[PDB]
Design a binder for this molecule. Structure first.
Ligand SMILES: CC(C)c1nc(CN(C)C(=O)N[C@H](C(=O)N[C@@H](Cc2ccccc2)C[C@H](O)[C@H](Cc2ccccc2)NC(=O)OCc2cncs2)C(C)C)cs1
Ligand SMILES: C[C@H](CCC(=O)NCCC[N+](C)(C)CCCS(=O)(=O)[O-])[C@H]1CC[C@H]2[C@@H]3[C@H](O)C[C@@H]4C[C@H](O)CC[C@]4(C)[C@H]3C[C@H](O)[C@]12C
Ligand SMILES: C[C@H](CCC(=O)NCCC[N+](C)(C)CCCS(=O)(=O)[O-])[C@H]1CC[C@H]2[C@@H]3[C@H](O)C[C@@H]4C[C@H](O)CC[C@]4(C)[C@H]3C[C@H](O)[C@]12C
Ligand SMILES: C[C@H](CCC(=O)NCCC[N+](C)(C)CCCS(=O)(=O)[O-])[C@H]1CC[C@H]2[C@@H]3[C@H](O)C[C@@H]4C[C@H](O)CC[C@]4(C)[C@H]3C[C@H](O)[C@]12C
Ligand SMILES: C[C@H](CCC(=O)NCCC[N+](C)(C)CCCS(=O)(=O)[O-])[C@H]1CC[C@H]2[C@@H]3[C@H](O)C[C@@H]4C[C@H](O)CC[C@]4(C)[C@H]3C[C@H](O)[C@]12C
Ligand SMILES: C[C@H](CCC(=O)NCCC[N+](C)(C)CCCS(=O)(=O)[O-])[C@H]1CC[C@H]2[C@@H]3[C@H](O)C[C@@H]4C[C@H](O)CC[C@]4(C)[C@H]3C[C@H](O)[C@]12C
Ligand SMILES: C[C@H](CCC(=O)NCCC[N+](C)(C)CCCS(=O)(=O)[O-])[C@H]1CC[C@H]2[C@@H]3[C@H](O)C[C@@H]4C[C@H](O)CC[C@]4(C)[C@H]3C[C@H](O)[C@]12C
Ligand SMILES: C[C@H](CCC(=O)NCCC[N+](C)(C)CCCS(=O)(=O)[O-])[C@H]1CC[C@H]2[C@@H]3[C@H](O)C[C@@H]4C[C@H](O)CC[C@]4(C)[C@H]3C[C@H](O)[C@]12C
Length: 329
């Protein structure tokens, strides 16, 4: 009905979070909404670590829909590890509710310093079942199976800093969120939001590259070889000890990413991957790009791509729909 959604709030023009609840008493948590994972976790009142002092914590004893599991789980992300045990309780996203298996986290030491530095309490996975720990049906799929929504799909309309808030819409496509044509790219993986695109950056290209559309990566990642070729004679300087590159914001050597399919063309101009850091010096920007090598040459089209392009994640049609995000409104 209409279209169920959760508001997306920009954090310092580099991350975005949405709020959902756990327990029949609707205990509120702030989440990274992560299309690149397939589990929900919240920090427990039983959490024994420094990071949890600054967070909204889940109290299973205060929920009468809580069902004990206790199966120990370690959740290993590329950027950190959280551990605890499975619990079952009511999960509410927008105005949609369902009983759900999630991880009750008691150790966040492996998630620092990012955890304490950030406003999110946990991570809400929007991936595929066979990627999940504990064989958990994805929230959006379950809601469709329960006839709580018209379609097993969700859309990302990211917030733009000082322009507009964003929305995760569950169960329907709103035309308000995108201008121009919506192009559907079929998945090249059984259990990941990953599509095939030719990647062109200036004179260098990777043919039929694996491209993950990842709401839960706050950067563009490119293969390390590709990045080394991109940055040759570009007048950019890497930060000592850190995989981040600094440039003059006005550096006209900075290239436009061009990603092409049989039916689509997506470009990402420097304004979409530049981060102003003028506290550090005059007219200096960081590139929101990092080198990351997968066994197959892979790009992560993270936050910076999804700031520019509205995205539809369709379980039933096993495709990602891409359209230019509407600027205002
Ligand atoms: C400067 C810039 C780099 C910034 N990053 C941030 C926030 N960070 C740390 C990230 O986004 N980091 C990314 C990340 O790990 N994202 C993660 C969420 C997260 C965020 C913050 C801290 C800890 C975890 C979420 C991403 O979807 C990644 C994508 C991925 C998957 C496999 C292999 C490589 C990459 N997913 C996972 O790591 O999930 C693995 C799984 C575990 N169980 C099932 S799959 C990396 C891919 C770069 C703020 S500013
Ligand atoms: C862009 C955001 C938010 C700024 C804001 O919200 N304004 C800020 C917050 C923390 C900042 C980084 C850290 O400081 C570490 C490091 C220090 C170096 O010196 C310059 C490079 C680097 C990577 C910084 C870049 C950038 O500056 C960041 C990401
Ligand atoms: C989430 C799964 C766990 C096994 C799983 O979910 N299998 C599906 C089948 C489910 N059943 C049918 C059995 C039910 C495990 C198994 C292998 C794991 C990755 C690798 O280690 C490489 C790498 C190490 C880094 O450190 C963290 C990132 C990364 C990408 C890891 C992520 C994640 O941690 C994976 C996918
Ligand atoms: C998971 C990857 C490392 C992948 C890996 O294990 N790579 C081994 C091969 C290395 N090389 C390609 C250089 C060898 C090939 C030689 S070649 O000549 O081919 O280049 C590592 C490398 C740099 C890491 C980030 C930074 O720490 C900054 C920050 C610290 C926070 O706390 C957590 C978040 C964040 C964003 C980190 C996330 C993640 O953790 C990254 C991407
Ligand atoms: C925007 C806020 C605070 C301002 C937080 C949220 C996540 C934080 C980053 C991650 O932690 C990864 C990495 C760890 C290094 O240690 C320092 C550099 C970097 C890039 C962090 C900078 C800064 O702290 C960020 C952007
Ligand atoms: C943004 C800040 C943080 C660290 C700074 C760099 C280091 O200071 C080392 C070195 C000193 C030279 O003087 C000028 C060149 C260089 C590479 C600096 C350039 C720039 O200032 C950086 C990247
Ligand atoms: C980054 C600074 C501006 C500094 C500032 O004050 N901001 C500007 C000022 C003059 C600019 C160059 C020239 O135009 C010639 C040439 C044009 C090509 O098109 C792109 C490459 C190149 C080398 C340009 C690069 C860059 O763009 C420069 C250095
Ligand atoms: C081979 C590497 C893993 C790292 C590696 O180089 N070697 C480890 C071998 C495998 N494990 C030891 C984890 C097996 C555990 C079972 S064991 O029997 O060992 O206990 C490959 C094999 C399959 C890959 C994932 C899947 O494609 C799905 C998905 C595609 C996206 O594009 C990127 C994210 C993700 C989760 C991929 C991550 C990573 O890229 C994997 C684990």
């Amino acid at each position: 009905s209409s279209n169920d959604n959760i508001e997306l709030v920009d954090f310092q023009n580099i991350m975005f979070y949405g709020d959902a609840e756990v327990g029949d008493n609707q205990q509120p948590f702030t989440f990274i909404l992560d299309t690149g994972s397939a589990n929900l976790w919240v920090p427990s009142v039983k959490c024994t670590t420094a990071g949890c002092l600054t967070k909204h914590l889940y109290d299973s004893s205060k929920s009468r829909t809580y069902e004990k599991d206790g199966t120990k789980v370690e959740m290993n992300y590329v950027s950190g590890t959280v551990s605890g045990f499975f619990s079952k309780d009511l999960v509410t996203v927008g105005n949609l509710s369902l009983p759900y298996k999630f991880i009750e986290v008691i150790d966040t030491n492996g998630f620092e310093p990012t955890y304490t530095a950030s406003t999110f309490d946990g991570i809400l996975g929007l991936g595929w079942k066979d990627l999940s720990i504990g064989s958990v049906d994805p929230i959006v799929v379950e809601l469709k199976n329960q006839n709580k929504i018209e379609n097993a799909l969700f859309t990302f309309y990211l917030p733009v800093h000082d322009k507009h808030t964003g929305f995760l819409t569950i169960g329907g496509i709103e035309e308000r969120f995108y201008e121009g044509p919506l192009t559907y790219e079929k998945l090249n993986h059984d259990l990941y939001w990953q599509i095939t695109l030719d990647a062109h950056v200036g004179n260098i290209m990777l043919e039929k590259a694996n491209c993950i559309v990842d709401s839960g990566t706050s950067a563009i990642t490119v293969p390390t070889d590709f990045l080394n070729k991109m940055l040759q004679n570009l007048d950019v300087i890497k930060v000592p000890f850190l995989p981040f590159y600094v440039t003059l914001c006005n550096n006209s050597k900075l290239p436009t990413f061009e990603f092409t399919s049989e039916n689509g063309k997506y470009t990402l101009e420097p304004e979409y991957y530049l981060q102003h850091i003028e506290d550090v010096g005059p007219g200096l920007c960081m590139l929101n790009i990092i080198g990351l090598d997968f066994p197959v040459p892979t790009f992560i089209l993270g936050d910076p791509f999804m700031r520019k392009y509205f995205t539809v994640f369709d379980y039933d049609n096993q495709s990602v729909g891409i359209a230019l995000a509407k600027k205002n409104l």
